[PDB]
Amino acid sequence: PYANQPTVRITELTDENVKFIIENTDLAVANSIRRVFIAEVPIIAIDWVQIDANSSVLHDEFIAHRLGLIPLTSDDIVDKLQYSRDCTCEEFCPECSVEFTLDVRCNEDQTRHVTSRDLISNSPRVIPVTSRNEQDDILIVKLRKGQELRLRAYAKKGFGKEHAKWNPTAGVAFEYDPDNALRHTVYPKPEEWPKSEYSELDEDESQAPYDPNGKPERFYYNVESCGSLRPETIVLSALSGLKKKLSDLQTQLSHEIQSD
Amino acid sequence: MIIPVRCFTCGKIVGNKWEAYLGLLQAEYTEGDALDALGLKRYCCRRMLLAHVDLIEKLLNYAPLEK
Amino acid sequence: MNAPPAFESFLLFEGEKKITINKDTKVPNACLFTINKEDHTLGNIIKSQLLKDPQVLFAGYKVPHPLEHKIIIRVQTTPDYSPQEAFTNAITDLISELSLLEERFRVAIKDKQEG
Amino acid sequence: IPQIGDKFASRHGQKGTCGIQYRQEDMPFTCEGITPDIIINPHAIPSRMTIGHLIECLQGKVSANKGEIGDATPFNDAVNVQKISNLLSDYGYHLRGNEVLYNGFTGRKITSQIFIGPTYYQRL
Amino acid sequence: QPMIYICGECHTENEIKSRDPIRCRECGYRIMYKKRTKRLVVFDAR
Numbered sequence: 001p002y003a004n005q006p007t008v009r010i011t012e013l014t015d016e017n018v019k020f021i022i023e024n025t026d027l028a029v030a031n032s033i034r035r036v037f038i039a040e041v042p043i044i045a046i047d048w049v050q051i052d053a054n055s056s057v058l059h060d061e062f063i064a065h066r067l068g069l070i071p072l073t074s075d076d077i078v079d080k081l082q083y084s085r086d087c088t089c090e091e092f093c094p095e096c097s098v099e100f101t102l103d104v105r106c107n108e109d110q111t112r113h114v115t116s117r118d119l120i121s122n123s124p125r126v127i128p129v130t131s132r133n134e135q136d137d138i139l140i141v142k143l144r145k146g147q148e149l150r151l152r153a154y155a156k157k158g159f160g161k162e163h164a165k166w167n168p169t170a171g172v173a174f175e176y177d178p179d180n181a182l183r184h185t186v187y188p189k190p191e192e193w194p195k196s197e198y199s200e201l202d203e204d205e206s207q208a209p210y211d212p213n214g215k216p217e218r219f220y221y222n223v224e225s226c227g228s229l230r231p232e233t234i235v236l237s238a239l240s241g242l243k244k245k246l247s248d249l250q251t252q253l254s255h256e257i258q259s260d
Numbered sequence: 261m262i263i264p265v266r267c268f269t270c271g272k273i274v275g276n277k278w279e280a281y282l283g284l285l286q287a288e289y290t291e292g293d294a295l296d297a298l299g300l301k302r303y304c305c306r307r308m309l310l311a312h313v314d315l316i317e318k319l320l321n322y323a324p325l326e327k
Numbered sequence: 328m329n330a331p332p333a334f335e336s337f338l339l340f341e342g343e344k345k346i347t348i349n350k351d352t353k354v355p356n357a358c359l360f361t362i363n364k365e366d367h368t369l370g371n372i373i374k375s376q377l378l379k380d381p382q383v384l385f386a387g388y389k390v391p392h393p394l395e396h397k398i399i400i401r402v403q404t405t406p407d408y409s410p411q412e413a414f415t416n417a418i419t420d421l422i423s424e425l426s427l428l429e430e431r432f433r434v435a436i437k438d439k440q441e442g
Numbered sequence: 443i444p445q446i447g448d449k450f451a452s453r454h455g456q457k458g459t460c461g462i463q464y465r466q467e468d469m470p471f472t473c474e475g476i477t478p479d480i481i482i483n484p485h486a487i488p489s490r491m492t493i494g495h496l497i498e499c500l501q502g503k504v505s506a507n508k509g510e511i512g513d514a515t516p517f518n519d520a521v522n523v524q525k526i527s528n529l530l531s532d533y534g535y536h537l538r539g540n541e542v543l544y545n546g547f548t549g550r551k552i553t554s555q556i557f558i559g560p561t562y563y564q565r566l
Numbered sequence: 567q568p569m570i571y572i573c574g575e576c577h578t579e580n581e582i583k584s585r586d587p588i589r590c591r592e593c594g595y596r597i598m599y600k601k602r603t604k605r606l607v608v609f610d611a612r
């Protein structure tokens with residue numbers, strides 16, 4: 001009637017992704033962790049734009065949408081910043097937002113690539129990922145001689161439930177039972193299917209013998225980071241966020257039980 | 261008109277790969293090998309780079325409204 | 328024109344309760360927990376943790392409409408137990424599991440970066 | 443911005459409106475976390491017999507995994523379904539374009555392996 | 567008050583008052599465009 005005692009085994013850790021395995025947990029816990037990776041791990045992203053001048057060939061909403069999708073390093077700052085809902089300030093303040101400025105003008109004859117390097121921030125900790133000290137800079141717009149783009153953005157705290165720009169992942173590979181032992185899939189021709197990278201089967205064997213007493217355990221994860229957070233920071237923040245969702249739910253539950 | 265920022269499917273950043281992709285293509289890479297060099301392993305991001313039409317280069321053939 | 332703001336999936340409206348408990352009259356020792364502004368992420372884990380309790384006879388959840396942003400979790404327990412107590416213990420167990428998982432992931436990261 | 447009620451179509455007479463939009467965590471995903479941009483109903487295929495839709499989806503998976511543009515010119519004996527399937531089996535995929543998908547809500551595998559791949563859609 | 571317009575052909579900033587034929591003073595071109603407002607329009611980057 002009590003909690004699982006999950007174990008963890010990290011099989012790869014780079015700056016780009018983290019590949020790990022959780023054992024002795026329920027499939028619902030594993031999938032809620034997977035969902036929180038995508039939808040409830042907050043990060044910083046541009047969510048307010050003011051175009052002072054845009055002579056480029058892309059209209060204002062195009063530039064704004066494009067700026068919103070630039071990942072901003074959010075590692076230690078996202079926990080400190082507040083949601084503008086919770087901030088007791090006006091529209092903005094340094095406690096709930098980060099100011100960016102962009103001011104580019106193509107005066108020379110060659111096309112000027114307005115890239116994420118031109119997004120200048122007031123906060124040194126929250127900068128475009130590509131601008132962080134290889135991979136090139138994200139391209140915001142190409143400008144022709146005489147074209148000019150001057151804007152002022154504000155980045156906010158949010159998560160992927162509100163908009164995919166606050167999603168920190170560039171793909172969450174999730175898998176379990178690589179050999180189809182639980183038979184949660186039913187291959188019409190099991191020989192036709194390639195083997196999982198996590199499979200432990202000799203090549204003559206297509207799928208594992210059916211396990212009637214089996215349950216999903218040993219979930220394999222590959223959490224790729226878009227750049228804002230480190231992959232391990234994505235996983236840790238996901239676990240913390242899920243735990244605080246449950247804690248808030250329990251607080252409200254206690255108020256409802258005692259009020260009855 | 262311009263290379264998207266993220267992959268529509270996964271959300272991987274592809275905005276910083278169009279210029280590198282073109283530079284690899286003029287370096288006599290095949291499109292597949294070029295996409296492998298940029299680290300686009302999921303066929304969604306390969307779709308993003310491989311099916312992109314840079315129309316902004318044609319929109320920059322017109323003089324702007326102000327000099 | 329008719330697009331709800333994206334925050335309405337996560338944010339509670341003023342005067343709207345996060346969770347409401349209603350006694351189920353069809354069978355004894357059953358309750359319906361209507362949880363607002365949550366989705367399958369918490370519903371699935373709460374249900375599956377409740378299924379681990381042998382004193383829980385029924386544990387299910389549903390999102391009645393995807394365009395709406397609430398879940399209903401039905402919990403029936405044995406007569407000596409309570410669905411509110413079962414729900415509380417399920418949340419406590421999930422919290423402890425996630426705390427242990429977080430500490431062990433921190434340890435695994437430390438080992439991986441160190442050696 | 444596309445929304446529920448906007449009409450979309452493939453190049454095979456397969457038109458339809460957006461019934462609902464799910465977030466990436468709510469959509470079904472492959473072992474490598476690819477979610478479909480669009481999900482269309484299998485019942486639109488059999489009566490219509492738009493097998494070109496399926497061959498285009500499979501050829502598009504091969505094209506995206508190979509780094510080329512598929513040749514779907516109508517009467518071309520150098521391109522049939524068996525060749526495309528053999529090509530797709532070389533990139534670590536089921537030769538017929540099926541994949542094991544997982545339920546986005548619960549994370550459990552879907553019993554029936556789903557047919558998924560790149561197809562050219564149009565917004566009308 | 568000035569309502570300065572831009573020329574479609576010479577791209578010249580020139581002021582034109584009401585009840586005035588629409589003519590660029592630099593090249594005589596007949597099509598003019600208004601300049602971007604100074605008002606503050608806000609975009610949610612979504």
Ligand SMILES: [Zn+2]
Nearest residue numbers: 087089093096
């Ligand atoms: Zn504030």
Ligand SMILES: [Zn+2]
Nearest residue numbers: 267270304305
């Ligand atoms: Zn992708």
Ligand SMILES: [Zn+2]
Nearest residue numbers: 573576590593
């Ligand atoms: Zn003129």
